[PDB]
Amino acid sequence: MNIFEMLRIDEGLRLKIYKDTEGYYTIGIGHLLTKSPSLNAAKSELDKAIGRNTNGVITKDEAEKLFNQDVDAAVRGILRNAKLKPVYDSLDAVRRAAAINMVFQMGETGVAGFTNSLRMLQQKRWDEAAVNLAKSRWYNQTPNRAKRVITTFRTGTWDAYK
Ligand SMILES: [Cl-]
Ligand SMILES: [Cl-]
């Protein structure tokens, strides 16, 4: 298992503009297009992201090209961030995947706000991190997905995804 398979499970694949769990226009593998209520603003972000006239639909290849870019951007965002990088460098490879999942989902600003959890992850207090991560809007809005990510941080295995 790897970050690409993890995120494909958590996010799904849709070839047509759709609204995410928050009501935002989204396409592909969790690629957020816009927070604006306008479907026209979303289509126009879509054409710009892809470099053609999509008319709100994209192929599998294009969805996967966006996906690759977003994973890459999530990683590079972790490495440039002063709060995130020390935590990340300290984790093993499975639990790095879980940090990328969270950043992909909620942006580096979001994750960097999980201060107490970050500190516990850094000290390798797995069970206490899991409890603290659970006390969050993120866990209450998307519990199934949040449990899978939390379990990964707690156990350092891919079990929740198998
Ligand atoms: Cl883009
Ligand atoms: Cl969920």
From Swiss-Prot:
Region forming the signal peptide: none
Family: Belongs to the glycosyl hydrolase 24 family.
Protein name (database record): Endolysin
Keyword Hydrolase: yes
pH profile of the protein: Optimum pH is 7.3.
Enzyme Commission number(s): 3.2.1.17
Stored HAMAP family: ENDOLYSIN_T4 (MF_04110)
Gene (name only): E
Keyword DNA repair recorded: no
Function: Endolysin with lysozyme activity that degrades host peptidoglycans and participates with the holin and spanin proteins in the sequential events which lead to the programmed host cell lysis releasing the mature viral particles. Once the holin has permeabilized the host cell membrane, the endolysin can reach the periplasm and break down the peptidoglycan layer.
Gene3D superfamilies named among the record's database cross-references: 1.10.530.40
Cross-referenced Pfam families: Phage_lysozyme
Entry's localization field: Host cytoplasm
GO biological process: cell wall macromolecule catabolic process; defense response to bacterium; peptidoglycan catabolic process; viral release from host cell by cytolysis
GO CC field: host cell cytoplasm
Catalytic residues of the enzyme: E11 (proton donor/acceptor), D20 (proton donor/acceptor)
SUPFAM superfamilies: Lysozyme-like
Induction: Expressed late in the viral replication.
Organism: Enterobacteria phage T4 (Bacteriophage T4)
